[PDB]
């Protein structure tokens, strides 16, 4: 096999600071010909992987020299000096000394000031209702840090069945996150209630961030 | 510029067959060492098969998980390779990347998805989300398989947009997108949601109206 293990799982770092990533192999990568086939890749959000470094320390053409790799045998490190925003993504190591295997990846997070979510609630469209379905949607946009807790409350009562959450990768542009929550109900229980509330608890607010509507039967 | 363009992906029944292809440009292909590498949540990055240099007699090797089921193919004169898959399994489902170069894994294409499922293809319902400065949304519900592409105003509206990764639910996908514009912008200006679903050859426009 040869499992390669990456550490840590995530790494937050401030711009201009150095980041350090580790990759251990379940065995030596030193080949019978004296070479060590250990490569590093970066997968940016929405893109496929891109070679950074091959054979331990050789920068592939195009790779800025802020990216640097070192190590021996079963022990390898990627160092990123002067972290820029556009560096965020998942860094992978792989070995091809033996039958090729990949690491689990290491997410580079860019530390950011702190930013409260802009919250938006949307009742089901008349279009969806006029097809016997009901979804209520909440967008929580442009927030930092990434940790956030979203609740749906219907007539004051929390509902967790039928909830569909989706979050974006970190946005290089401003370093923030965004989230989408969709509560789906039968058209029947939707109409059985009239207070609808998307809540959210975040570092940036002392009390829950509330966005509600009332149905006007 | 080097491009690796995958093609031929899509939905396949378990037990079925599928061919995907990779077209290369911007480099001397006969010199190139080529790989297929797949990605999935349930396994991350996975090497699938390789095909070596002309210098190295186009020697092939396959991951043990696909040995016997998968055939890699290459044509240096046409700068193309393929992966021809048989007896596909749910576990083969993934994004399949084409990768290669003189240096090996030097370049990667954007990938093509391979989804192995008996679920049938289903066009999405597109719902306009009007609000109750201003945020609007579009809800893309109940489709299979991935992907769709979502656009605001035929793409000409891209400032203030957030499109979210699809999530699967009882054999169906839903995705959503938000767009934020100034109050002077809408409803004065028409804003509409454009959604394409290649697998169903459907393309739908939903205008966001005030309610």
């Amino acid at each position: 096999d040869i499992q390669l293990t990456q550490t840590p799982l995530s790494l937050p770092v401030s711009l201009g600071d150095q980041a350090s990533i580790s990759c251990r192999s379940s065995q030596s990568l030193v080949h019978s010909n004296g070479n060590t086939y250990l490569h590093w890749y970066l997968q940016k959000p929405g893109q496929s992987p891109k070679l950074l470094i091959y054979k331990v320390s050789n920068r592939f053409s195009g790779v800025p020299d802020r990216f640097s790799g070192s190590g021996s045998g079963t022990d390898f490190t990627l160092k990123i000096s002067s972290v820029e925003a556009e560096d965020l993504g998942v860094y992978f190591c792989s070995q091809s000394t033996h039958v090729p295997t990949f690491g689990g990846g290491t997410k580079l997070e860019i530390k950011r000031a702190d930013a409260a979510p802009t919250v938006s609630i949307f009742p089901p469209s008349s279009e969806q209702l006029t097809s016997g379905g009901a979804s209520v949607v909440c967008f929580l946009n442009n927030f930092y840090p990434k940790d956030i807790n979203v609740k749906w409350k219907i007539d004051g009562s929390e509902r967790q069945n039928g909830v569909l959450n989706s979050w974006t990768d970190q946005d290089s542009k401003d370093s923030t996150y965004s989230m989408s929550s969709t509560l789906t109900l039968t058209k029947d229980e939707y109409e059985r209630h009239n207070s609808y509330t998307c809540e959210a608890t975040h570092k940036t607010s002392t009390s829950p961030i509330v966005k509600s509507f009332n149905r006007e039967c | 510029q080097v491009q690796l363009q995958q093609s031929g992906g899509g939905l396949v029944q378990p037990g079925g067959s599928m061919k995907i292809f990779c077209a290369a440009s911007g480099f001397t292909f006969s010199d190139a060492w080529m790989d297929w590498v797949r990605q999935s949540p349930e396994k991350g990055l996975e090497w699938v098969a390789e095909i070596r240099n002309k210098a190295n007699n186009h020697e092939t090797y396959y991951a043990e998980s696909v040995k016997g089921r998968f055939t890699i193919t290459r044509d240096d004169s046409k700068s193309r390779m393929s992966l021809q898959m048989n007896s596909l399994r749910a576990e083969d489902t993934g994004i399949y990347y084409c990768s290669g170069g003189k240096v090996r894994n030097a370049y990667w294409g954007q990938g093509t998805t391979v989804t192995v499922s008996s679920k049938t293809t289903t066009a999405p319902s597109v719902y306009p989300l009007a609000p109750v400065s201003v945020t609007l949304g579009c809800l893309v519900k109940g489709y299979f398989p991935e992907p769709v592409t979502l656009t605001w105003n035929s793409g000409s509206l891209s400032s203030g947009v957030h499109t979210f990764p699809a999530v699967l639910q009882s054999d169906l996908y839903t995705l959503s997108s938000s767009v934020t514009v100034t109050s002077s912008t809408w409803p004065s200006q028409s804003i509409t949601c454009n959604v394409a679903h290649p697998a169903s050859s459907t393309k739908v426009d939903k205008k966001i109206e005030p309610r």
Partner: peptide
């Protein structure tokens, strides 16, 4: 490891 290319 495995036999590499020339």
């Amino acid at each position: 490891g495995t036999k590499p290319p020339l």
